């Protein structure tokens, strides 16, 4: 009570000098590491030369100047690839877009500067829809280095900028962005000190420079004093603005000038005051106190050119109001107008002007003379928008019938790309006959939706909440799909607009969750020593357990017998320690887990089976069955049409068992009956030998490889070298990896992943973690899953009418050779390119009709830290110019592991899946968890980096693909899958109607059939 | 009339106070062993 | 479970209206139903039909047989759901129609006139309301229960 | 060893010097279950649980007298070369992988610069495939975990089943070729060994170092017995049979 009774007078004087909103809305919110920057303009300006050739060439001649100037400042690899596009044009037969291109070479190739050159301005109070956005989109059209505050740094600001600079950046723009408060002295502190003093972020062994040096030449105080009218502030707001504006501003000038004095003299700093008849008036009182001080201090003369614009009226930030002035005489503009027309004063003549003395321009066409007030304007648009806006009807249409959840009909790929007949026979073919995944979103199909267009269906919704436990179907009351919870009839129209919530936050990149139903605090990294003299409590027992309790410690202690406990005692002197582990938390660590609540016995697993074996094995036999059914197949099937012994298994597990291992650990020390057969059922190899010994039963090859991050690729590598040497011709391949507890410690400890504590400090979003390519990346976010994928050679999937989702035309894994440095990297995988056309890569794509510039999405590893993301681009160039790649042709990177995280052995199955997805339907998925790409990323002549659902569909037909996993430990993985249309063209004409239909069939059962499991019954796994 | 707490408290309380006494006044008990 | 939705109106109105050739308590002269649950049952089908076939989940869409001779005449009523819908003569029946089809022919009113099911209740199925079938021309007499 | 443990206790619970804040993060989860008295002298806070709490105190017997075939007593990996620090720092299965395979080329009259003299480095694969991967590895780092031991903080690297075989490349042979580690548990070996003349059919090299390890731990003998598959020695000294 003593100094909180000063304290309770401090606060109440505050309230009512000031008031009791005082310390929120003053406090603080600055901090230099959640600073952004928007500098990706070379990648936007290539994803933009694919979007131009994606739109018909009816809205081109429309915007000839416009796009014509847009591609104005942009690297010679801008260049380049705008001549391969013209060419392309020339080929397609389309002068207009030929015309358009060449005329983008041309003036990417112009190295002058922006008439904005080598100026940062700083423009505050830049939200949407304001002349701050406006007067911002006009710097980055001149090319000049913006930095923009804003009261708070959320994800739809962070889009909202991010469009902004994508959408006006020209030449060398860059625009900078920070979270300050413009009602708080420290923030303007902390604000002019790190626009001036450079920003080096020091990391433990090396140091990163994001700032070298800016002196701020143009200002732009905009910042609004605040919109609110629901506290009824007036006598607080009267103050507060008048803040806001006068004092706010005039320390940030004086800041501004501070930094840039005695570093370079004559270089006096330019502030432009926006002034708004009465509030006009309050504009000129504005003005006549930050003028009367330039005249009055002699040092503002020689450090800052004072200049400010009378501006007049905006029709932004309605339609009565314009059309009342517009009546009255008075000529308005809109935001980009009055933008040039208050920029246009910032030129070498302007500035001359108020170098003597400051300039007084009016910018008012009109309603300089108050002809009419303000008020009296109000009067009319209140009286007229109480009719307009007033009114609120609604016309709907005499049916209004309820819509259903589609049902399951076929597919709707791409058109299929078109090249000749192939000498080449299906018998020298390995086609990738099926597969599955079981990760982060689920199964395979709704974490291709998630990855496209980022909403589930009605499908992957119930798909999703049927697995999760969410949705469960009963038929005693009426036959329907029951909530757990609570039991009613759910209808199937509201399906989505109910459950696709629940469902999203239950699924994807989110923080780990427990769903062992085990304590958190059982393993950690933690010490305890203790040495204790005291008495020795003890329970009840044998003579025989005491004695072998004492048996070690007789020399250390003195045993006494207690009758009535029928045991010894124990108590040892001074000097013994007693193990009383003491156990952390890192908590908070964001994952790829499975969904949550993820039942696999609603898959038809056995309950006793599930909780018997690992969940590795469980999470196979889901993955395995699900790829079966969903390609219209069945071991059974197979084995009627080729021998047992022709059919193997090469499912090689990543570690093998994580979860299972650290049970039986904490199992064995905490007494918990160990399953005695689990330490059999710990080994890696036996989650693909109980999928055999369960599902397939296949006599094949049982080799389960482990690479620790491309398990899955090298597993897919020896199948389809097994299909080639004849020893198979079904090959079900894949691999599978988990999280646990240690991992993520071990993982954290490396200091090679992402860290939540860092990641959290620059204020990135949590399921925003795994930023591939992007310039705040700092390690991957460790994931569980995987799956299975099915290989087969052309002769048994023709012969057997299976659906072919892709053509593995070369499948490989590489070293890195003789490296003592560890961080030394890696560039092994080139190894596919000795020879240039003559190379193993390029002769199986040459053998399968596909050329080098023909291959057009590369599904990069991209782990997302800071090492591999650069060298691995740098691979892949040189890998493309080994080939023999075209100079400038587009490769679209597809980065997988933004979504999905990095499941360590599993990573290649949703790489291969993806890629085969894409190829598919011909959309090119967007790494949305991207903001702007690194500097070092611009030596890539070739790569195009996706930010928006590209939708090919008859305009660019993709026909070839790379798969690369640069693993852990000098190990490496190259796939390149060719389209299926390669297997259809390679079988002679007279058959490929016939397979097409019979594949189709069985594409459609297989859905359908998935979609009467999801409803009716008959469970999958059914095990005689 | 349930009156064994206060039975119950004053074993505990004697106990504890012999046991308190045991420990400083050296005298060690315990030291036989079944050796029948 | 295995009927496209062309094929399966088409069979319920072949079923149930025939060729026009009862002569049984007919519910009225120019209107081919035998009872209103019969159409009610038609159109409930019918509005099942678009609700599945047509491209959305979300929002309700304009129906067509707006309660007049479009959705008396059955027969045109299925060729304008097709002429919109020309999909509905191939994409087969989701599975959740089939409990929705037995719960439909379940309703009160005028029992239908087939077993949906074949089940443990074949015979209440088939023997509910059998008797009407031997005073309409219609039927054979081989074929009706006397 | 497993053994159950369970006793509740009522009594004092003396404690160390220790600071504020790690006494608050003890008596982060044990307020509602105890009371909380501070020490000055001390400068923490005394956490006192009262009846219901348990304490783990994991007694350990021992399966007395277990036979295996481990490496030859004494072993010393140093000897042939290996630096200390290394052998320390990597797990032991890393170490007699080194050992293995520079025992073979050198026996063979070899070494892989004299492949790379003869074929491009591309053309030497290594399919070393570890049985199970470091298990005694593994089980230091869980004990190390638990005990505070501050482990390496790269051993979770250098615990997993490939990256022996990948140590091995990145220090003796410094392959390019294609690096296939396969697991089976009990035929590891000769899977690799399958798909090493797979791969050497094919074309894809033509000098392919196949292998495998495997290790024996005191989870691997509990385990072993637990599914009484292996030899247990009871019945075998009741035989009469020598060890």
């Known amino acids: ?1024 | 009339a349930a009156a064994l707490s206060e039975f119950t408290d004053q074993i505990t309380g004697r106990e504890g106070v012999l046991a308190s006494a045991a420990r400083l006044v050296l005298g060690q008990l315990g030291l036989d062993d079944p050796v029948n | ?146």
């Open chain 1, 1 to 1024: 009570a003593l100094p909180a009774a000063p304290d309770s007078e401090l606060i109440d004087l505050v309230t009512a000098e000031l008031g009791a909103d005082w310390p929120r809305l003053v406090a603080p919110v600055f901090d230099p590491k959640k600073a952004v920057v928007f500098d990706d303009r070379w990648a936007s300006a290539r994803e933009d030369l694919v979007k131009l050739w994606l739109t018909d060439e009816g809205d081109i001649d429309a915007d000839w100047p416009r796009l014509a100037e847009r591609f104005e400042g942009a690297g010679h690899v801008v260049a380049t690839q705008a001549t391969w596009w013209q060419g392309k044009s020339l080929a397609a037969g389309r002068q207009i877009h030929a015309s358009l291109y060449g005329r983008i070479a041309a003036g990417a190739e112009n190295p002058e500067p922006g008439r904005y050159g080598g100026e940062v301005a700083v423009v505050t109070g830049a939200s949407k829809g304001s002349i701050a956005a406006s007067v911002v989109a006009r710097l980055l059209d001149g090319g000049a280095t913006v930095i923009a505050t804003t009261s708070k740094l959320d994800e739809e600001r962070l889009a909202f900028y991010r469009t902004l600079y994508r959408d006006h950046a020209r030449y060398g723009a860059a625009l900078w962005l920070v979270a300050a408060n413009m009602a708080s002295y420290s923030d303007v502190d902390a604000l002019v000190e790190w626009i001036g003093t450079e920003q080096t972020e020091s990391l433990g062994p090396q140091s990163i420079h994001i700032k070298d040096a800016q002196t701020p030449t143009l200002l732009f105080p905009f910042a609004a004093p605040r919109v609110v009218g629901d506290l009824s502030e007036a006598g607080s707001r009267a103050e507060m603005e008048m803040k806001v504006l006068l004092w706010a501003v005039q320390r940030l000038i004086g800041g501004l000038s501070t930094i840039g004095a005695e570093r370079d003299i004559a270089s006096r700093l330019h502030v432009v005051l926006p002034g708004s008849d009465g509030a006009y008036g309050e504009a000129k009182s504005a003005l006549d106190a930050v003028v009367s001080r330039w005249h009055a201090e002699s040092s503002w003369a020689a450090r800052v050119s004072l200049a400010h614009a009378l501006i007049g009226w905006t029709r932004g930030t309605n339609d009565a109001i314009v059309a009342a002035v517009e009546e009255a005489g008075v000529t308005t503009y809109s935001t980009d107008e009055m933008a040039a027309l208050l920029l246009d004063l910032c030129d070498a003549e302007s500035k001359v002007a108020a170098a003597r003395s400051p300039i007084k321009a009016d910018l008012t066409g009109g309603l300089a003379e108050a002809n009419l007030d303000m008020a009296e304007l109000a009067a009319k648009a209140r009286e007229q928008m109480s009719a307009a806006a007033a009114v609120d009807e609604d016309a709907e249409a005499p049916g209004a019938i309820a819509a259903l959840p589609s049902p399951p009909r076929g597919f709707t790929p791409a058109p299929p790309p078109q090249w000749d007949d192939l000498d080449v026979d299906p018998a020298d073919l390995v086609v990738i006959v099926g597969g599955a995944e079981i990760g982060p979103y689920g199964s395979s199909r709704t974490r291709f939706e998630m990855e496209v267009e980022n909403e589930l269906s009605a499908a992957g919704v119930l798909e999703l909440a049927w697995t999760t436990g969410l949705i469960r179907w009963e038929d005693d009351p009426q036959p329907g799909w029951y909530d757990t919870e609570s039991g009613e009839m759910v209808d199937e129209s509201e399906l989505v607009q109910r459950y696709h919530d629940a469902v999203v936050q239950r699924v994807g990149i989110r923080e780990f969750v427990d769903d062992g139903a085990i304590d958190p605090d059982h393993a950690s990294p933690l010490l305890v020593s203790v040495f204790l003299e005291k008495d020795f409590a003890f329970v009840v027992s044998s003579e025989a357990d005491a004695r072998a309790f004492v048996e070690f410690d007789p020399e250390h202690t003195v045993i006494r017998p207690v009758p009535d406990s029928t045991d010894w005692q124990v108590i040892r002197k001074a000097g013994t320690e007693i193990r009383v582990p003491r156990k952390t938390k890192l908590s908070r660590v964001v994952g790829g887990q499975i969904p949550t609540g993820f039942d696999p016995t609603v898959w038809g697993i056995s309950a006793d089976m599930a909780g018997s074996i690992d969940r590795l094995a469980v999470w196979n036999m889901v993955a395995t069955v699900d790829a079966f059914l969903s390609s219209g197949f069945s071991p059974a099937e197979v084995m009627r049409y080729v021998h047992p012994s022709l059919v193997a298994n090469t499912q090689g597990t990543g570690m093998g068992g994580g979860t299972s291992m650290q049970t039986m650990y904490h199992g064995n020390l905490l007494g918990r009956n160990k399953p005695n057969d689990i330490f059999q059922e710990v080994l890696p190899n036996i989650i693909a030998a109980h999928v055999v010994q369960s599902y397939v039963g296949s006599y094949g090859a049982m080799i389960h490889p482990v690479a620790a991050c491309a398990t899955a690729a090298v597993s897919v590598e020896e199948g389809v070298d097994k299909i080639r040497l004849g020893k198979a011709q079904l090959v079900v391949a894949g691999g599978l990896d988990d999280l646990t507890l240690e991992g993520i410690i071990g993982f954290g400890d490396m200091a090679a992943t992402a860290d939540t504590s860092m990641m959290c400090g620059r204020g990135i979003h949590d399921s925003k973690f795994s930023r591939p390519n992007d310039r705040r990346r700092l390690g991957f976010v460790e994931a569980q899953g995987g799956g299975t994928i099915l290989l087969a050679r052309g002769d048994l999937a023709l012969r057997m009418g299976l659906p072919v989702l892709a053509v593995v035309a070369f499948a490989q894994s590489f070293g890195d050779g003789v490296h003592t440095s560890i961080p030394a990297p890696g560039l092994g995988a080139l190894g596919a390119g000795r020879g240039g056309k003559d190379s193993p890569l390029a002769r199986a794509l040459a053998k399968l009709g596909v050329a080098a510039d023909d291959v057009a999405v590369i599904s990069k590893h991209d782990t997302s830290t800071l090492a591999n993301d650069p060298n691995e681009t740098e691979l892949h160039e040189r890998l493309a110019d080994a080939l023999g790649r075209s100079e400038g042709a587009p490769l679209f990177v597809v980065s997988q592991k933004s979504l999905t995280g990095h499941a360590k052995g599993g990573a290649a199955v949703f790489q291969m899946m993806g890629l085969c997805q894409i190829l598919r339907d011909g959309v090119i998925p967007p790494n949305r968890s991207l903001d702007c790409v690194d500097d070092e990323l611009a030596g890539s002549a070739h790569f195009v980096w996706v930010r928006d659902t590209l939708r090919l569909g008859g305009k660019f037909p993709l026909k070839a693909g790379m798969l690369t996993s640069l693993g852990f430990g000098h190990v490496s993985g190259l796939v390149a899958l060719v389209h299926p249309q390669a297997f259809i063209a390679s079988l002679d004409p007279a058959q490929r109607a016939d397979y097409q239909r019979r594949a189709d069939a069985r594409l459609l059962a297989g859905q359908r059939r998935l979609a009467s499991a999801i409803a009716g019954g008959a469970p999958m796994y059914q095990r005689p």
């Open chain 3, 1 to 146: 479970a295995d009927m496209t939705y062309l094929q399966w109106l088409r069979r319920y109105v072949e079923l149930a209206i025939g060729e026009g050739n009862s002569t049984a308590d007919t519910a009225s002269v120019g209107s081919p139903w035998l009872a209103d649950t019969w159409r009610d049952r038609f159109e409930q089908m019918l509005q099942r039909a678009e609700a599945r076939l047509h491209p959305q989940d979300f929002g309700p869409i304009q129906t067509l047989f707006t309660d007049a001779g479009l959705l008396d005449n059955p027969q045109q009523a299925i060729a304008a759901l097709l002429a919109r819908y020309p999909d509905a003569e191939t994409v087969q029946l989701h599975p959740a129609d089939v409990p929705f089809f037995v719960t439909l022919c379940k309703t009160l009113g005028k029992p239908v006139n087939f077993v949906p099911v074949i089940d443990q209740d074949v015979r209440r199925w088939w023997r509910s309301d059998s008797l009407w079938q031997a005073h309409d021309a219609r039927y054979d007499a081989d074929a009706v229960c006397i």
